[PDB]
């Protein structure tokens, strides 16, 4: 099938330059065109420009123009994107799509997308806190517990309650910045018989910081 | 500089009802030659890349149900779904391809469900994060709808604003509700000076506000 692959999130200091790739398998890569798409978290898709395999030929939106820099490599099937001189106003997710056949001029396949986050922060780990009720639970129904990352950088944490079993009932949150560290909560809902009876565990990982720790919820 | 504009930004509607809306141009998007706009139209689902639904204005490509119906012609176009589904969650755009491309700010989709007052919790600080040097009291807002929702602070009943941070998720795709999780962070002694901490949600569910609150004395 026809395929479009992308690289993973990529961290980059101010100023700098990022070269991102979008791999084609399973067409003729010199037949189609490739798009380039920004998306902002929680915003729009942006049309960056396209790109014309063979000929190498580049069309860009006004607001692009010197900032991205779309190229082909047709040994490689890749195509490339670059953005020179970050600044946080570059950090979003960068898609790469094929037109489909025709005088479509549609985006019939996507990349899975490139994360750029544009920031002169640091590896942090995170510092996990676990989250337990002030005054013991009435006797019916469910108690909330939680827990508490708090200080890290880059993103993601996974956090997971008592190595994955419990799934029901979670609500981890969107990570909000606070002055170069994020802080996240998860919560979980469960049975007032299993806690404090049973033993309940959040298992905060971060990749970035080479981190797992496993915290255990006291109730006192 | 083609220019396009879609409305509404945002909408709610209930399984097994039909929903439409507007994609709007700046430009004549249909070519004297050919007899086509070039108006296409995408969903994106969370933590998804964008998928084609509809093109030259109301062709649906592969795969795509009957329901999603697009049509227009000009500089006026529509999006219509009926019989919607709780899987068409997601953030619908249109895009231009007359000249260059340019895509909508899109129209955002979530499912209609009863309204459920929100079932909240707060939470004191941990011992390991008051050793630290900081203190951070949390409160959740689970499993509510509608959206919209009003969180209030009180340290020994006196409104708080500042240190406060929330954050939402997306509608939960099985329970159809929204959660928030409010945080209000403190340092070490003004904590520990105070004694009671109160959270306060106001949602249209009631007109008398929902209150859990600690005493910090206790424990």
């Known amino acids: 099938q026809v395929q479009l692959q992308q690289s993973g999130p990529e961290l980059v200091k101010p100023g700098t330059s990022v070269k991102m790739p979008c791999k084609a398998s399973?067409?003729?890569?010199?037949?189609?065109?490739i798009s380039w798409v920004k998306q902002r978290t929680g915003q729009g898709l942006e049309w960056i420009g396209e790109?014309?395999?063979?000929?190498?030929?580049?069309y860009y939106n006004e607001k692009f123009k010197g900032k991205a820099t779309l190229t082909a490599d047709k040994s490689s099937n890749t195509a490339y994107m670059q953005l020179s001189s970050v600044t946080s106003e570059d950090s979003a997710v960068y898609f790469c799509?094929?037109?489909?056949?025709?005088?479509?001029?549609?985006?019939?396949?996507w990349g899975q997308g490139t994360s750029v986050t544009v920031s002169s922060a640091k590896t942090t780990p995170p510092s996990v806190y676990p989250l337990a009720p002030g005054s013991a639970a009435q006797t019916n129904s469910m108690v909330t517990l939680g827990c508490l990352v708090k200080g890290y950088f880059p993103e993601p944490v996974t956090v997971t309650w008592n190595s994955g079993s419990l799934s029901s009932g979670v609500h981890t949150f969107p990570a909000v910045l606070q002055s170069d560290l994020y802080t996240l909560s998860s919560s979980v809902t469960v049975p007032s018989s299993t806690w404090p009876s049973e033993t309940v565990t959040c298992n905060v990982a971060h990749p970035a910081s080479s981190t797992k720790v496993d915290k255990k919820i006291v109730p006192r | 500089d083609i220019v396009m504009s879609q409305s509404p930004s945002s909408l709610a509607v209930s399984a097994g009802e039909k929903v439409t809306m507007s994609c709007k141009s700046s430009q004549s998007l249909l070519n004297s030659r050919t007899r086509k706009n070039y108006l296409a139209w995408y969903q994106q689902k969370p933590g998804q890349s964008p998928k084609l639904l509809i093109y030259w204005a109301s062709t649906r490509e592969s795969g795509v149900p009957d329901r999603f119906t697009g049509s227009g012609s000009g500089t006026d176009f529509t999006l219509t779904i009926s019989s919607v589904q709780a899987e068409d969650l997601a953030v619908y755009y249109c895009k231009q391809s007359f000249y260059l491309r340019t895509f909508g700010g899109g129209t955002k989709l979530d499912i209609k469900r009863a309204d459920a007052a929100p079932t909240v919790s707060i939470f004191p600080p941990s011992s390991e994060q008051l050793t630290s040097g900081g203190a951070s009291v949390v409160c959740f807002l689970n499993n509510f709808y509608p959206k919209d929702i009003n969180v209030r602070w009180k340290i020994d009943g006196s409104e708080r604003q500042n240190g406060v941070l929330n954050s939402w998720t997306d509608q939960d795709s099985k329970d159809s509700t929204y959660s928030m999780s409010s945080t209000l962070t403190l340092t070490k002694d003004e904590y520990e000076r105070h004694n009671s901490y109160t959270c306060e949600a106001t949602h249209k569910t009631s007109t008398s506000p929902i209150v859990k609150s600690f005493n910090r004395n206790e424990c």
């Open positions: 799509a094929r037109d489909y056949y025709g005088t479509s001029f549609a985006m019939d396949y």
């Open positions: 399973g067409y003729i890569f010199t037949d189609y065109v």
């Open positions: 790109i014309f395999p063979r000929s190498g030929s580049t």
